[PDB]
């Protein structure tokens, strides 16, 4: 509530986000850093064994 | 009971009713 | 019940959220004037009152109530309309009182109320005024509900509210057991032909009755035939008498809706079972028997109306005609000479109702389609193919055709040249899931429509109709159905009490002349003065059987039944009997919605939902919280982007589904960027890094 | 799945598939042919539905499990059939509710359905670890009738030898099925067989075998009824016998242990078998309701009269002016409550146990005995809509039939009763919503924080006159915890080391130690910057094992606390407290 | 011991439409399943005759009224649902019914084509006055069991065609009961009596033995076929 | 161990499958990227050949590639890395 | 009539005598017409042989003691119960099992007379501790179904012969369930599931044809009133 004063002071502050919060990441609609959003989990290299690839 | 074309329906009234029901649309 | 209705809110009245929960509750002054039972279940409790039976309006604008006045232990018939204000000073007596043949009390000590409303117990000296009756705290629709005194008032509020939502059937058999209200109800309802003048019948029709008054003149009486409701139900009327009958002023000549023989009927008498069975009565699930759908005993009538006009636009005029743009002729051979379809066509969804066509203007085409039109050698026209078609999941015949026109003297609002209306009716079978209930607040939906053979049945083999579950009994406190189960089977069975030497003590008082019953009987019990419990057990003691000497129902009111599935008898006797039930209006076409792709808003890109729209499904907030609780974020990115607001993705993912290719990556929600432009409107250097 | 709605949903997919085999020229013959609903779509439709998940919702959304996944197949008609056990998580009743439909298209989300959102594997509470698809009312009375124990039954194990043998012995279970299906052998009788496929309890196969009481092919005598036999036939092969009457708490312990020591897939199989047999006997149990079933309390009248002379003396003493208003008011409160207590005790004391009415709450299915006391007996004291009790009191019952006046008073507590419901379920999501707000940055971050601080646990305090009494509240406190400190004994040795999951055998071991204080790692000491560590948190309620890395626990905590706040009733003890 | 004989049947006639059928001896507890078997058959599995559809010249659709008659059309539909007829051949033949003047529309007033008969001639249908005319044609078809209403638009019928649900059912009520000796030296045998009442179309021998032939037909693959 | 036969979606059981991945998440993304390679592969199989290969395990008659990727996982025929 | 489909039968082979049957398709509602019917049918329509009465020397008065063996009396009873024997003679035939000294007696250790046969001779029966000479009398006759234990016609006057239950049915367990698959093309037709438990004497396929054959033989009573009746037809193979 009272969103105007909530904005205009931070504009003086020129503060930004860290995209750390997730409800905000809903607002931007990008992937949240929770559940299926961690980089170690969404950055998997997927490739077979070469022995199964020898079967062809 | 004060209705001309009424079919009979048997009741369990132990009392009587001295005053009948008024007209409902009279409100 | 829409009339006689007491409302609190409104202009000149309170605000709904800005009125506390203190005006809502009842106060002991509410007695005898407004029934506290009838109110809607939602956010209106205490806001909508219901006016009682014997109330009357003060010319000043208040409630007046008649009361019997007693002098010195002599109750007079002196009917005195009274208000609550003077009632505070005075002494109100008891309805069920030991009154001895004059107005004289057996007991000297009487329960009484003070002006506080506290219940005090007094000697018989001060009493000036007496109640006129029981049921004084009871409204009209409340008064049609038997055995109220044995069940919960909350459940009474439920099923009492439910009975206004009943639907008419096509048969209207009278209920087996009721009270002294239903015959008294419809005669003041005014949907049923009441005899105006005492005369004799001259000649009737299927549609009119020409009466013969005793003094000279005659009069015809046109009954209404299949009139449409505000909700689409049937208002057909039908004669019940012959052509030569000596009738009297006030008598019933013909009934219309759910009434029969002068009294209301909300359903049929059916054979009930109280066992739990195979999870098909699992927590108020309800099952049926096959005979009823084939004997059509629950068939409904539903009339749905459509309406469209011919108008004028800036370019020109709308056109109703038989001339169509590019179309089949199979979709035309059931239409008349001048557009609209003819009498008695059976439609399916997507069929064309009225041939409507408007001019386009003067546009250009793609060269490729213009090439194809040269290939197929047919330019169409400079018009638009925008005709009236039927909405979906809808069928039935069209009966009436109504049509107006501005040039044909018809008064109708401006800009419009011509008007048409369509009336579409349909017989609907009863099927699964529809809303069924009994009078005691019990309710539920149809799970399974069985065959006729997998069914509980008697030693005489007679199949049952429905089966109800056990556990609706204890926690919901609704044993009045059990009461009318015993009394109902007493009515279907019939008795003749064998007390030829001495009357038993249960039947020693109640009426006389009642100790027989020809079966298929017509009985009633009032609200608070009906039967008593030992009497109910007493009527079971006489058991006039169907054909042969056969006590199917014992002195405990249960029967021995066979498996309808494997065959063996059951190792316990089972409570069974008859119950009067009813049907409501929440059919499965009403609340069904479904959509893959349809119209959208013009403000936002969101799907739009209304009647003729497919509807859309509003997805909330805590839902999204639980989606976070899974952490299935790709689902969320699917939901809020390609399904909600980004236009340019919808063509991509839809076309990918068409080709069966890969799911494309969800692009930037453009609806998000709209906020950024709003910030850029207001002196904000916003920026992403 | 209702099929008209199904074909209405799956339109572009079936429009793709029907053209692929040459039933159509294009998209336009496809879509138009759908709008004609020609009969060639249906055999296509079974191909296009299978292996594709679906999602369903019921408003309002209380906790997480109110939306779960399934694989649909076709259902005739316009009604949605449903497996009954999800009604607990849905808080559902067959009154005429609605449920929603959802559908993913990206196969990533389809895997999200088929692995996490699938209802097959969300079985326990995220808040307590008890199950949710644990069976209920009709399965409860089915198993309770099927497993109750009745002496004096037909053909029961006799022995009166001296003229004829013991006569309660049978070789195979199917033998006892056959003789049971003849009318001679009765179902619910104590009999003796030898079981060649099932496992005896610990004491029996301990002395029989010692090394291993394996039971594929070796037998052992017993004495039970046939119902528990075919009960444990539905159990898995490795699990031993039970031989008790089935209570909801007992079966809760059964699903608890089998949920512990076994993989997940066997559980749902066993449960579906249990609802099958439980319906099968839930039919033949024969539980009816008659007017004769509700009996009459015989000498309740003299108790009423006794407290009428008491209340008459008291109100006479108020009429004299010997005491004031509130004192006689409270005197009537206490005296009539004592009348209520006596009629309750005599009420339960009067009945036999084979009343089907009491048998419901004897199983602990639904309601309590107070609802019976309102049913048969007396109602008693009604509150004001203000809130004060009313001194009349209510003396009769529903079964006795009321007067006008008592019912007219019962209006108050009824209607003021139903006033509060929408107030509760409305106001709960407000506070709950703020709990969702402040907690939204509470995730799992890493594996191990490795501080050494930690909280201490009460751990079944001494009471040295018995020297060990058990904490009742172990269950929300000691399980799913990790040791940051080594468990030390009377001087001895470290019996339990740093870092174990602290289940029931830890309670057994440290209970065998007899100690009451162990410093245990918690989340309050976590020294990470943002988020907390899995060692700091412990076993999640979901898997019953250690929580993974990709979790945000605060949301589940928010739904867990904010969820059951509807069911709070009655200085303040209420929910706005 | 293996007691060796074969049970038999006989008939005891109660009325024209109702009769008794005794079967003995039996295996112990056996006749329950056979009884539910034959009952469950006779509630479902007997072919018969039923009128299907009609046409009246004075109407186009259902929900209007004829001048002169007293009754609306749907009530007449519900009346003619309660009729009974028997077919000889197997093809959709037609019927007729025409009447002028005041009176009561009886079932015996109808002209039959050769091959069909109706077993309740005085059954009430409707009434008329001086001013009324009766016209109705009737289409009776052969089949079994229940059928719902077929679509006119899917069919190739005219505008005046009225599809109504048809029920092929001769039977009214089937029940039975047992008599179990179970003598206490284990030579046990039982006794079965059967009672079925049809709706005056065919004899109980007809549906009884015919349904039995359907059973013997039904268990052919249950024999050494596999 | 020996449990039953499974049916459809619950075939195969996840119990062996949860052994292969330390989490559930990388199991999800694992099968996800694999199935993306397959639905690449059939619309690559139609026109000219590429270095895309597969499927390693035989399918049914009409089977969606999601379950095919699942049976590739249960066959234990490939590996992965984190990110 | 004619059913306009054709139901089929197929057997599925589990372990030795654990056959499994399905039938498709059936119109509603006909699984329940033959589920419990085939249950009671294969239950008690086929003859068989079982233990009729027994007497052991020295077990005259004390009903629970046999010296020289570990086993009590009632164990010998139940162990002799699960013993398959097939015969053809309409008579209570006498048998004798006898053995001196210690030993572990098996099912093949008895001398059979002519007309009987043992289908599990390697089955264990009894163990003899030391120097306990055995002699057991055995009676087996033919018959059908399951019987309760008959009180013998002596009423106390019996020499010590012990009659028990006789299980003449070679079947062991019948169970089944239904389903109603293919709801649209077949228009809500059905699916049959069968499961039978069988002794080692014969194949349950053999018992299937014979018992259901006798079911067909049983409704020929219904068939012999109207040859020219109207039944619903399946058709040829
Ligand atoms: Mg509900
Ligand atoms: Zn940490």
Q: What secondary structure does DSSP assign to C338-374, as a single string?
A: TSSB-TTPEE-TT-EEE-EEEE--S----HHHHHHHH
CA dihedral of residues C98, C102, C108, C110 (deg, nearest 10): 60
Residues E17, E180 contacting (CB under 8 angstroms): no
Examine the domain organization and report whether D276 and D158 are in the same domain: yes
Taking contacts as CB-CB distances below 8 angstroms, the residues of chain A near D114 are: none
Task: Select from A44, A52, A53 the Cβ nearest to the Cβ of F29.
Answer: A44
Residues D107, F36 contacting (CB under 8 angstroms): yes
Helix (H, G, I), strand (E, B) or coil at D57: strand
CA gap D338, C514 in Å, rounded: 44
Q: Which of E108, G140, G85, F71 is nearest to D114 (CA)?
A: F71
Examine the domain organization and report whether D314 and D403 are in the same domain: yes
Q: Which of D233, D243, D171 is nearest to D198 (CA)?
A: D233
Residues linked to residue G86 through DSSP beta bridges, in sequence order: G117
Taking contacts as CB-CB distances below 8 angstroms, the residues of chain F near A38 are: 25
Nearest residue on chain F to C657, alpha-carbon basis: F39
Tell me if D87 is assigned to a ligand binding site.
no
Residues C584, C625 contacting (CB under 8 angstroms): no
Residues G204, E226 contacting (CB under 8 angstroms): no
DSSP run (H or E) holding G97? strand G93-99
Range of the domain at D238: 137-284
Q: Which of G48, G54, G71 is nearest to G172 (CA)?
A: G48
The answer, for E212 touching chain D at a CB cutoff of 8 Å, is no
C281 Cα distance to chain centroid: 23
CATH of the domain at D412: 1.10.132.30
Q: How far is CA D303 from CA D338, D343, D348, G34, in A?
A: 10, 8, 15, 61
The answer, for G78 touching chain D at a CB cutoff of 8 Å, is yes
> Residue C651, CB half-sphere, CA atoms under 13 Å: how many?
2
> Can you give the length of chain F in residues?
83
Q: How far is CA A38 from CA A46, C521, D484, D549, D550, in A?
A: 17, 76, 28, 9, 7
Examine the domain organization and report whether D364 and D278 are in the same domain: no
Residue G57: how many other CB atoms lie within 10 Å: 13
Taking contacts as CB-CB distances below 8 angstroms, the residues of chain C near D10 are: 596
Q: Which of D283, D331, D327 is nearest to D307 (CA)?
A: D331
Domains of chain G, with CATH numbers? 1-47+169-237 (3.30.1360.10), 48-168 (2.170.120.12)
Beta strand C466-467 pairing with C269-273: parallel
Return the DSSP state at G148. Answer: P
With 0-12 CB in 10 A as exposed, 13-18 as middle and 19+ as buried, what is E144?
middle
What is the count of residue pairs from D and G with beta carbons less than 8 Å apart? 51
Ligand 1 mean position, distance from CA D77 (Å): 21
Taking contacts as CB-CB distances below 8 angstroms, the residues of chain E near D183 are: 29, 182
Q: Which of G107, G104, G144, G106 is nearest to G127 (CA)?
A: G104
G partners (3+ CB pairs within 8 A) are C, D, E
With 0-12 CB in 10 A as exposed, 13-18 as middle and 19+ as buried, what is C369?
exposed
Q: Which of E210, E191, E215, E209 is nearest to E23 (CA)?
A: E191
How far apart, in Å, do the first and last CA atoms of chain B sit?
24
Ligand 2 mean position, distance from CA A32 (Å): 22
CA gap D522, D388 in Å, rounded: 46
CA gap D118, D80 in Å, rounded: 18
Query: Angle at CA B27, nearest 5°, toward B23 and C1?
Result: 85
Ligand 2 mean position, distance from CA D529 (Å): 9
Query: Angle at CA C603, nearest 5°, toward C600 and C606?
Result: 35
Phi, psi of C371 (to 5 degrees): -60, -50
> Residue C674, CB half-sphere, CA atoms under 13 Å: how many?
10
Residues G87, G115 contacting (CB under 8 angstroms): yes
The answer, for D440 touching chain A at a CB cutoff of 8 Å, is yes
Helix (H, G, I), strand (E, B) or coil at F42: helix
Residues C515, C563 contacting (CB under 8 angstroms): no
Examine the domain organization and report whether D240 and D311 are in the same domain: no
> Can you give the length of chain A in residues?
56
Min Cα distance C556 → chain D (Å) is 6
Residue E88, C-beta contacts closer than 8 angstroms, at least 6 positions apart: E115, E116
Query: Angle at CA C636, nearest 5°, toward C632 and C640?
Result: 180
Nearest residue on chain A to D550, alpha-carbon basis: A35
Helix (H, G, I), strand (E, B) or coil at C484: helix
Q: How far is CA E129 from CA C221, E70, E75, E132, F26, in A?
A: 17, 8, 18, 6, 86
DSSP run (H or E) holding C46? none
Residues E60, E159 contacting (CB under 8 angstroms): yes
Task: Select from D112, D530, D550 the Cβ nearest to the Cβ of A34.
Answer: D550
Q: Which of C222, C240, C234, C140 is nearest to C188 (CA)?
A: C140
On the question of a cis peptide bond just before residue C533, with omega within 30 degrees of 0, the verdict is: no
Tell me if D97 is assigned to a ligand binding site.
yes
> Residue D253, CB half-sphere, CA atoms under 13 Å: how many?
8
| Sign, CA torsion E178/E179/E184/E188 | negative
Nearest residue on chain C to E152, alpha-carbon basis: C346
The answer, for G146 touching chain C at a CB cutoff of 8 Å, is no
Ligand 2 mean position, distance from CA F30 (Å): 28
Residues C436, C443 contacting (CB under 8 angstroms): yes
CA gap C212, C201 in Å, rounded: 5
Residues D520, D455 contacting (CB under 8 angstroms): yes
CB contact under 8 A, B4 and C133: no
CA gap D189, D226 in Å, rounded: 7
C482 Cα distance to chain centroid: 24
Nearest residue on chain F to A43, alpha-carbon basis: F83
The ligand that comes nearest to the alpha carbon of residue D536 is 2
Tell me if D43 is assigned to a ligand binding site.
no
Residues C287, C446 contacting (CB under 8 angstroms): yes
SS (H, E, C) chain E: CCCCCCCEEEEEECCCCEEEEEEECCCCCCHHHHHHHHHHHHCCCCEEEEEEEEECCCCCCCCCCCECECCCHHHHHHHHCCCCCECCCCCCEEEEEEEECCEEEEHHHCECCCCCECCCCCCEEEEECCCCEEEEEEEEEEEEEEECCCCCCCCCCCCCCEECCEEECCEEEEEEEEEECCCCCCCCCEEEEEEEEECCCCCHHHHHHHHHHHHHHHCCCCCCCC
CATH of the domain at D201: 1.10.274.100
Which method was used? cryo-EM
DSSP run (H or E) holding C291? helix C290-294
With 0-12 CB in 10 A as exposed, 13-18 as middle and 19+ as buried, what is D417?
middle
The radius of gyration of chain D's CA atoms, rounded to the nearest angstrom, is 31
Tell me if D95 is assigned to a ligand binding site.
yes
With 0-12 CB in 10 A as exposed, 13-18 as middle and 19+ as buried, what is C190?
exposed
Return the DSSP state at C642. Answer: I
Helix (H, G, I), strand (E, B) or coil at F79: strand
DSSP-assigned states of every residue in C558-591: EE--B-SSS-PBPSS-EEEEEEEEEEBS--HHHH
Residue D434: how many other CB atoms lie within 10 Å: 12
Ligand 1 mean position, distance from CA C151 (Å): 21
C411 Cα distance to chain centroid: 36
Q: Which of D149, D230, D160, D231 is nearest to D190 (CA)?
A: D149
Those of residues 260-319 in D touching chain F at CB distance below 8 A are 263-266, 269
What are the extents of the domains in chain F? 1-83
Taking contacts as CB-CB distances below 8 angstroms, the residues of chain A near D441 are: 20-22
The answer, for C646 touching chain A at a CB cutoff of 8 Å, is no
Burial E166-195 (b: 16+ CB within 10 A, else e): bebbbbebbbbbeebeeeeeeebbbbbbbb
CA gap D235, D271 in Å, rounded: 9
CA gap G44, G40 in Å, rounded: 6
Residues linked to residue G176 through DSSP beta bridges, in sequence order: G194
Residues A20, C613 contacting (CB under 8 angstroms): no
Helices (H), D285-324: 300-320
Helix (H, G, I), strand (E, B) or coil at C439: coil
């Amino acid at each position: 509530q009272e969103t105007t004063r909530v904005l205009t002071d931070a504009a003086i502050n020129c503060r930004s986000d860290k995209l750390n919060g997730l409800k905000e990441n809903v607002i931007i609609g990008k992937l949240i850093p929770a559940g299926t959003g961690i980089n170690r989990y969404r950055n998997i290299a997927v490739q077979p064994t070469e022995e199964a690839r020898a079967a062809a | 009971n004060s209705v001309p074309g009424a079919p009979n329906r048997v009741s369990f009234a132990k009392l009587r009713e001295p005053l009948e029901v008024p007209g409902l649309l009279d409100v | 019940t829409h009339k006689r209705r007491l409302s609190a809110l409104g202009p000149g009245g309170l605000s709904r959220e800005r009125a506390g929960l203190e005006v809502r509750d009842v106060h002991p002054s509410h007695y005898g004037r407004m029934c506290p039972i009838e109110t809607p279940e939602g956010p209106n409790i205490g806001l909508i009152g219901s006016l009682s039976v014997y109330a009357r309006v003060n010319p000043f604008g208040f409630i007046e109530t008649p009361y019997r006045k007693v002098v010195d232990g002599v109750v007079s018939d002196e009917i005195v309309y009274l208000t609550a204000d003077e009632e505070d000073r005075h002494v109100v007596a008891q309805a069920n009182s030991p009154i001895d043949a004059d107005g004289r009390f057996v007991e000297p000590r009487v329960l009484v109320r003070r002006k506080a409303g506290e219940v005090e117990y007094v000697p018989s000296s001060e009493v000036d005024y007496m109640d006129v009756s029981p049921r004084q705290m009871v409204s009209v629709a409340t008064a049609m509900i038997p055995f109220l005194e044995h069940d919960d008032a909350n459940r009474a509020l439920m099923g009492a509210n439910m009975q206004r939502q009943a639907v008419p059937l096509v048969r209207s058999e009278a209920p087996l057991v009721g009270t002294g209200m239903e015959l008294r109800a419809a005669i003041d309802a005014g949907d049923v032909v009441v005899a105006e003048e005492s005369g004799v019948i001259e000649e009737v029709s299927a549609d009119y009755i020409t009466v013969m008054h005793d003094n000279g003149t005659r009069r015809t009486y046109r009954m209404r035939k299949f009139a449409r409701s505000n909700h689409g139900t049937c208002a057909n009327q039908c004669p019940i008498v012959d052509a030569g009958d000596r009738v009297e002023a006030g008598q019933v000549i013909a009934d219309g809706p759910c009434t029969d023989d002068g009294e209301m009927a909300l359903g049929k008498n059916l054979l009930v079972a109280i066992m739990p069975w195979e999870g098909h009565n699992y927590e108020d699930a309800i099952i049926l028997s096959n005979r009823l759908v084939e004997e059509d005993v629950l068939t409904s009538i539903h009339i749905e109306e459509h309406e469209i006009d011919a108008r004028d636009t800036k370019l020109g005029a709308e056109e109703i005609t038989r001339d169509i743009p590019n179309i089949s002729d199979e979709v035309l051979a059931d239409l008349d000479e001048r557009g609209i379809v003819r009498i008695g066509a059976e439609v399916r969804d997507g069929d064309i109702l009225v041939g409507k066509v408007t001019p386009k203007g003067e546009t250009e085409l793609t060269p490729e389609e213009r090439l194809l039109r040269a290939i197929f050698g047919e330019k169409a026209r400079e018009v638009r193919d925008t005709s009236l078609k039927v909405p979906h999941g809808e069928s039935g015949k069209v009966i009436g055709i109504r049509v107006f026109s501005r040039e044909d003297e018809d008064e109708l609002p401006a800009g419009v040249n011509e008007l048409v209306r369509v009336y579409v009716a349909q017989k609907r079978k009863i099927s699964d899931g529809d809303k069924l209930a009994g009078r005691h607040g019990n309710k539920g939906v149809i799970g399974k429509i069985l065959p006729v053979e997998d069914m509980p049945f008697l030693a005489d083999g007679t199949p049952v109709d429905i089966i109800l579950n056990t556990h609706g009994v204890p926690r919901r406190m609704n044993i009045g159905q059990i009461l009318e189960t015993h009394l109902g089977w007493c009515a279907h069975s019939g008795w003749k009490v064998d007390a030829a030497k001495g009357v038993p003590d249960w039947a020693a008082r109640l009426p006389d002349e009642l100790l027989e019953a020809q079966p298929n009987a017509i009985v009633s019990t009032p609200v608070f003065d009906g039967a008593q419990e030992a009497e109910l057990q007493g009527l079971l003691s006489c058991t006039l059987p169907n054909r042969d000497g056969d006590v199917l129902v014992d002195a405990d009111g249960k029967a021995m039944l066979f498996d309808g599935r494997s065959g063996e008898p059951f190792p316990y006797p089972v409570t069974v009997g008859y119950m009067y039930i009813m049907k409501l209006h929440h059919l499965v076409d009403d609340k069904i919605h479904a959509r893959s792709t349809g119209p959208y808003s013009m403000i936002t890109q969101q799907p739009l939902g209304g009647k003729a729209q497919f509807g859309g499904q509003r997805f909330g907030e805590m839902e999204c919280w639980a989606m976070q609780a899974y952490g299935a974020a790709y689902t969320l990115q699917e939901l809020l982007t390609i399904k909600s607001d980004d236009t340019v993705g919808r063509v991509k993912v839809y076309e990918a589904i068409v080709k069966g290719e890969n799911i494309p990556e969800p692009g930037i929600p453009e609806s998000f960027k709209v906020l950024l432009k709003e910030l850029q409107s207001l002196c904000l250097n916003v920026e992403v890094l | 799945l209702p099929k008209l709605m199904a074909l209405e949903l799956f339109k572009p997919f079936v429009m793709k598939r029907l053209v692929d085999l040459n039933h159509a020229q294009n998209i336009k013959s496809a879509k138009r042919m759908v709008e004609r609903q020609r009969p060639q779509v249906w055999d296509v439709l079974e191909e296009v539905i299978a292996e594709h998940p679906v999602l369903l919702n019921r408003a309002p959304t209380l906790h997480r499990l109110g939306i779960q996944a399934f694989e649909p197949m076709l259902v005739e008609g316009k009604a949605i059939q449903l497996h009954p056990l999800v009604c607990e998580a849905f808080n559902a009743d067959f009154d005429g509710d609605q449920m929603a439909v959802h559908l993913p298209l990206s196969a990533e989300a389809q895997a999200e359905a088929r692995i996490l959102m699938l209802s097959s594997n969300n079985i326990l509470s995220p808040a307590s670890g008890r199950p949710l698809a644990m069976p209920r009312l009709d399965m409860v009375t089915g198993l309770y009738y099927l497993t109750t124990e009745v002496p004096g039954d037909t053909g029961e194990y006799q022995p009166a030898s001296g003229d004829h043998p013991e006569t309660g012995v049978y070789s195979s279970p199917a033998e006892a099925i056959m003789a049971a299906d003849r009318g001679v052998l009765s179902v619910r009788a104590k009999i003796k067989v030898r079981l060649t496929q099932l496992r005896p309890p610990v004491e029996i196969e301990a002395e029989l075998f010692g090394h291993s009481g394996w039971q594929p092919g070796d037998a052992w005598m017993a004495e039970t009824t046939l119902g528990r036999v075919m009960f444990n036939e539905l159990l898995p092969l490795g699990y031993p016998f039970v031989n008790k009457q089935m209570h909801k708490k007992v079966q809760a312990a059964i699903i608890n242990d089998l949920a512990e020591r076994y993989p997940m897939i066997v559980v749902a199989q066993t449960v579906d078998k249990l609802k099958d047999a439980g319906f099968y006997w839930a039919t033949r149990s024969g539980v009816t309701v008659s007017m004769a079933d509700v009996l009459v309390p015989p000498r309740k009248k003299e108790i009423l009269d006794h407290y009428e002379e008491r209340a008459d003396k008291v109100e006479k003493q108020f009429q004299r002016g010997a005491l004031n208003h509130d004192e006689r008011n409270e005197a009537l409160v206490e005296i009539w409550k004592e009348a209520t207590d006596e009629v309750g005790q005599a009420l339960r004391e009067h009945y036999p146990d084979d009343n089907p009415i009491i048998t419901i709450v004897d199983s602990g299915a639904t309601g309590n005995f107070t609802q019976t006391r309102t049913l048969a007996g007396m109602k008693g004291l009604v509150t004001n809509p203000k809130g004060e009790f009313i001194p009349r009191p209510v003396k009769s019952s529903f079964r006795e039939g009321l007067t006008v006046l008592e019912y007219f008073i019962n209006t108050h507590g009824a209607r003021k009763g139903l006033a509060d419901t929408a107030l509760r379920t409305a106001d709960s999501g407000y506070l709950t919503r703020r709990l969702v707000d402040v907690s939204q940055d509470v995730i799992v971050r890493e594996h191990d924080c490795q501080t050494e601080r930690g909280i201490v646990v009460e751990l079944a305090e001494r009471a040295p006159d018995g020297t060990l009494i058990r904490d009742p509240y172990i269950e929300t406190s000691a399980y799913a915890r990790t040791l940051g400190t080594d468990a030390v004994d009377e001087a001895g040795n470290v019996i339990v080391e740093r870092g174990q999951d602290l289940g029931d055998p830890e309670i057994d071991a440290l209970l065998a130690a007899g100690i009451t204080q162990v410093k245990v790692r918690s989340v309050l000491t976590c020294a990470t910057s943002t988020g907390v560590c899995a060692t700091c948190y412990g076993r999640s309620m979901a898997t019953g094992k250690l929580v993974d890395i990709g979790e945000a626990v605060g949301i589940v905590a928010a739904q867990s606390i904010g969820e059951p706040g509807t069911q709070l009733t009655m200085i303040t003890g209420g929910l706005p407290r | 011991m293996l007691i060796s004989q074969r049970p038999t049947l006989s008939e005891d006639v109660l009325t024209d439409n109702r009769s008794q059928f005794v079967i003995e001896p039996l295996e112990p507890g056996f006749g329950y399943t056979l009884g539910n078997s034959l009952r469950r058959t006779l509630l479902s599995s007997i072919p018969g005759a039923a009128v299907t559809s009609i046409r009246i010249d004075g109407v186009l659709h259902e929900f209007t009224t004829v001048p002169g008659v007293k009754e609306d059309v749907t009530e007449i539909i519900l009346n003619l649902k309660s009729l009974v007829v028997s077919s000889e051949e197997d093809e959709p033949v037609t019927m007729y019914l025409r009447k002028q003047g005041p009176g009561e529309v009886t079932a015996g007033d109808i002209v039959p084509p050769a091959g069909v008969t109706v077993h309740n001639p005085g059954m009430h249908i409707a009434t008329l006055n001086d001013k009324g005319k009766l016209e109705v044609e009737l289409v009776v078809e052969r089949g079994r069991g229940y059928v719902p209403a077929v679509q006119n638009r899917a069919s190739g019928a005219e505008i005046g065609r009225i599809p109504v649900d048809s029920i092929y059912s001769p039977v009214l009520k089937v029940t039975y009961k047992v008599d179990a000796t179970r003598v206490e030296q284990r030579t046990d045998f039982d006794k079965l009596i059967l009672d079925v009442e049809t709706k005056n179309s065919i004899s109980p021998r007809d549906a009884l033995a015919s349904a039995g032939k359907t059973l013997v037909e039904l268990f052919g693959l249950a024999r050494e076929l596999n | 161990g020996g449990y039953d036969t499974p049916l459809g979606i619950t075939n195969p059981p996840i119990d062996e499958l949860l052994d292969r991945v330390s989490s559930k998440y990388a199991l999800v993304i694992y099968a996800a990227k694999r199935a993306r390679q397959i639905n690449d592969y059939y619309n690559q199989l139609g026109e000219g050949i590429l270095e895309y290969v597969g499927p390693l395990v035989e399918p049914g008659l009409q089977e969606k590639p999601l379950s095919i990727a699942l049976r590739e996982i249960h066959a234990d025929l490939l590996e992965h890395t984190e990110g």
